[PDB]
Design an enzyme around this catalytic site. Structure first.
Site, PDB file in Angstrom:
ATOM      1  N   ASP A   1       0.897  -1.176   0.000  1.00  0.00           N
ATOM      2  CA  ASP A   1       0.000   0.000   0.000  1.00  0.00           C
ATOM      3  C   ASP A   1       0.927   1.216   0.000  1.00  0.00           C
ATOM      4  O   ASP A   1       0.762   2.159   0.779  1.00  0.00           O
ATOM      5  CB  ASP A   1      -0.935  -0.082   1.206  1.00  0.00           C
TER       6      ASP A   1
HETATM    7  C1  LIG Z   1      -1.637  10.368  -7.191  1.00  0.00           C
HETATM    8  C2  LIG Z   1      -2.928  10.743  -6.464  1.00  0.00           C
HETATM    9  C3  LIG Z   1      -4.029   9.691  -6.654  1.00  0.00           C
HETATM   10  O1  LIG Z   1      -3.543   8.528  -5.953  1.00  0.00           O
HETATM   11  C4  LIG Z   1      -3.568   7.327  -6.509  1.00  0.00           C
HETATM   12  O2  LIG Z   1      -4.064   7.076  -7.581  1.00  0.00           O
HETATM   13  C5  LIG Z   1      -2.916   6.265  -5.685  1.00  0.00           C
HETATM   14  C6  LIG Z   1      -1.548   5.956  -6.269  1.00  0.00           C
HETATM   15  C7  LIG Z   1      -3.793   5.053  -5.454  1.00  0.00           C
HETATM   16  O3  LIG Z   1      -3.031   3.858  -5.263  1.00  0.00           O
HETATM   17  C8  LIG Z   1      -2.804   3.087  -6.429  1.00  0.00           C
HETATM   18  C9  LIG Z   1      -1.541   2.282  -6.228  1.00  0.00           C
HETATM   19  C10 LIG Z   1      -1.483   1.137  -5.233  1.00  0.00           C
HETATM   20  C11 LIG Z   1      -0.151   0.403  -5.297  1.00  0.00           C
HETATM   21  O4  LIG Z   1      -1.762   1.611  -3.907  1.00  0.00           O
HETATM   22  C12 LIG Z   1      -0.836   2.501  -3.259  1.00  0.00           C
HETATM   23  C13 LIG Z   1      -2.626   0.222  -5.594  1.00  0.00           C
HETATM   24  O5  LIG Z   1      -2.836  -0.791  -4.612  1.00  0.00           O
HETATM   25  C14 LIG Z   1      -3.912   0.972  -5.852  1.00  0.00           C
HETATM   26  C15 LIG Z   1      -5.179   0.128  -5.948  1.00  0.00           C
HETATM   27  O6  LIG Z   1      -3.848   2.142  -6.607  1.00  0.00           O
HETATM   28  C16 LIG Z   1      -4.652   5.166  -4.255  1.00  0.00           C
HETATM   29  C17 LIG Z   1      -3.849   5.160  -2.947  1.00  0.00           C
HETATM   30  C18 LIG Z   1      -5.888   4.301  -4.110  1.00  0.00           C
HETATM   31  O7  LIG Z   1      -6.097   3.795  -2.832  1.00  0.00           O
HETATM   32  C19 LIG Z   1      -5.754   2.510  -2.425  1.00  0.00           C
HETATM   33  O8  LIG Z   1      -6.697   1.599  -2.971  1.00  0.00           O
HETATM   34  C20 LIG Z   1      -6.567   0.258  -2.530  1.00  0.00           C
HETATM   35  C21 LIG Z   1      -7.605  -0.574  -3.279  1.00  0.00           C
HETATM   36  C22 LIG Z   1      -6.778   0.193  -1.033  1.00  0.00           C
HETATM   37  C23 LIG Z   1      -5.691   1.068  -0.402  1.00  0.00           C
HETATM   38  N1  LIG Z   1      -5.688   1.087   1.067  1.00  0.00           N
HETATM   39  C24 LIG Z   1      -6.905   1.680   1.661  1.00  0.00           C
HETATM   40  C25 LIG Z   1      -5.443  -0.258   1.633  1.00  0.00           C
HETATM   41  C26 LIG Z   1      -5.818   2.491  -0.919  1.00  0.00           C
HETATM   42  O9  LIG Z   1      -4.771   3.302  -0.396  1.00  0.00           O
HETATM   43  C27 LIG Z   1      -7.201   4.695  -4.771  1.00  0.00           C
HETATM   44  C28 LIG Z   1      -7.929   3.455  -5.275  1.00  0.00           C
HETATM   45  O10 LIG Z   1      -6.890   5.525  -5.912  1.00  0.00           O
HETATM   46  C29 LIG Z   1      -8.024   5.481  -3.763  1.00  0.00           C
HETATM   47  C30 LIG Z   1      -9.364   5.990  -4.291  1.00  0.00           C
HETATM   48  C31 LIG Z   1     -10.456   5.644  -3.287  1.00  0.00           C
HETATM   49  C32 LIG Z   1      -9.299   7.466  -4.553  1.00  0.00           C
HETATM   50  N2  LIG Z   1      -8.514   7.770  -5.766  1.00  0.00           N
HETATM   51  C33 LIG Z   1      -9.281   7.487  -7.036  1.00  0.00           C
HETATM   52  C34 LIG Z   1      -7.774   9.079  -5.666  1.00  0.00           C
HETATM   53  C35 LIG Z   1      -8.659  10.270  -6.093  1.00  0.00           C
HETATM   54  C36 LIG Z   1      -6.453   9.010  -6.369  1.00  0.00           C
HETATM   55  O11 LIG Z   1      -6.627   8.843  -7.795  1.00  0.00           O
HETATM   56  C37 LIG Z   1      -5.402  10.105  -6.124  1.00  0.00           C
HETATM   57  C38 LIG Z   1      -5.363  10.345  -4.619  1.00  0.00           C
HETATM   58  O12 LIG Z   1      -5.826  11.320  -6.758  1.00  0.00           O
END
Ligand SMILES: CC[C@H]1OC(=O)[C@H](C)[C@@H](O[C@H]2C[C@@](C)(OC)[C@@H](O)[C@H](C)O2)[C@H](C)[C@@H](O[C@@H]2O[C@H](C)C[C@H](N(C)C)[C@H]2O)[C@](C)(O)C[C@@H](C)CN(C)[C@H](C)[C@@H](O)[C@]1(C)O
Ligand SMILES: Nc1nc2c(ncn2[C@@H]2O[C@H](CO)[C@@H](O)[C@H]2O)c(=O)[nH]1
Length: 287
Positions: free
Chosen positions: A191
């Site tokens: 994560d």
């Molecule tokens: C660069 C900024 C963007 O950030 C990202 O894209 C991150 C790299 C991304 O994370 C990327 C990369 C990676 C490796 O997580 C760090 C991967 O596991 C996921 C699914 O996507 C995040 C952490 C994800 O949130 C993670 O979603 C997992 C399913 C669960 C996890 N936690 C709660 C255990 C949670 O943090 C999520 C799914 O995007 C969260 C979702 C609810 C909201 N997003 C849509 C936002 C608006 C984001 O687009 C962002 C903040 O604008």
């Protein structure tokens, strides 16, 4: 939750807090509180939103105890960890960024120390031995388990929430290219992105904060959070530095990372299954 309620909950755990606090809900399953105790010590509080989270709390306690040995960065030092309250002393530095949603960077995006320090940390994390992981009853995916489980995730996401036809074809292609998948799976944070990495302004990575997800799994997943926020050139520099330290790469680490990243909405959906607003946000990011 009110300050006085928080004070009472901490006092039920022998932690005596002032009424000076700030809050963070950017987290998912816990409420976060920045608190200050009557001795002048700053604390981080994680309040379970729900009952019945005891096994996750115990697991993460194990993971922290395990990774504490193997890393040169700080990790949270749980002093309280019941089913009603997790609490540790605040770590040295603030997160590289915060999210409201909107990115609020706290260090210079192009900070070069971040690449070298992050690469070091990735190396240390990915060196942790598999026998310890299994001893701690952690989840162990192996590369043979990887592809069909991601197939199952495609299955359970398409029908339950819907998937873009373009999103589906890519994910099927990614599962298709045997070249992209690594021969070896190593213990991963699971994560990891700038929001969970702590660093000074110059970008030297002091600590890693949320360890509940960490399990043995594909190495690229630790890389993907980075390329999403710093871009592909950054990612390449990180891969290079990581290999220079001695980190186990393969010929397609970069492209496999790109595919993991592209697969963000898919693992988003599957973890969402829970909240209708998160299902709404996925559904958008998927169609
Ligand atoms: C660069 C900024 C963007 O950030 C990202 O894209 C991150 C790299 C991304 O994370 C990327 C990369 C990676 C490796 O997580 C760090 C991967 O596991 C996921 C699914 O996507 C995040 C952490 C994800 O949130 C993670 O979603 C997992 C399913 C669960 C996890 N936690 C709660 C255990 C949670 O943090 C999520 C799914 O995007 C969260 C979702 C609810 C909201 N997003 C849509 C936002 C608006 C984001 O687009 C962002 C903040 O604008
Ligand atoms: N400064 C700081 N923020 C933290 C710490 N632990 C958690 N957080 C914040 O709490 C959120 C949820 O854990 C993270 O995304 C961080 O923003 C810590 O030790 N220090």
């Amino acid at each position: 939750m009110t300050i006085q309620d928080i004070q009472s909950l901490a006092e039920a755990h022998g932690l005596l807090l002032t009424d000076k606090m700030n809050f963070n809900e950017m987290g998912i399953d816990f409420k976060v509180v920045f608190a200050l105790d009557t001795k002048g010590q700053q604390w981080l509080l994680r309040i379970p939103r729900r009952d019945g989270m005891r096994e996750q709390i115990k697991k993460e306690k194990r993971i922290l105890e395990l990774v504490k040995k193997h890393l040169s960065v700080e990790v949270p030092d749980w002093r309280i960890s019941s089913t009603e309250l997790v609490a540790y002393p605040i770590l040295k530095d603030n997160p590289v960024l915060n999210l409201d949603y909107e990115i609020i960077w706290n260090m210079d995006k192009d900070s070069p120390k971040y690449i070298t320090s992050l690469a070091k940390t990735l190396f240390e994390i990915h060196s942790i031995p598999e026998k310890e992981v299994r001893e701690n009853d952690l989840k162990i995916m192996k590369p043979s388990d990887l592809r069909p489980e991601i197939a199952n995730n495609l299955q359970l996401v398409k029908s339950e929430i819907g998937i873009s036809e373009q999103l589906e074809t890519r994910y099927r292609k990614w599962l298709d290219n045997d070249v992209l998948w690594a021969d070896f799976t190593q213990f991963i944070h699971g994560d990891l992105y700038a929001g969970h990495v702590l660093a000074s302004k110059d970008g030297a990575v002091s600590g890693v904060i949320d360890w509940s997800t960490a399990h043995i799994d594909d190495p690229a997943i630790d890389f993907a959070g980075h390329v999403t926020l710093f871009g592909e050139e950054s990612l390449k520099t990180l891969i290079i530095e990581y290999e220079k330290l001695g980190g186990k790469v393969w010929n397609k680490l970069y492209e496999q990372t790109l595919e993991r990243a592209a697969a963000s909405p898919l693992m988003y959906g599957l973890f969402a299954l829970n909240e209708s607003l998160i299902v709404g946000a996925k559904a958008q990011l998927g169609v």
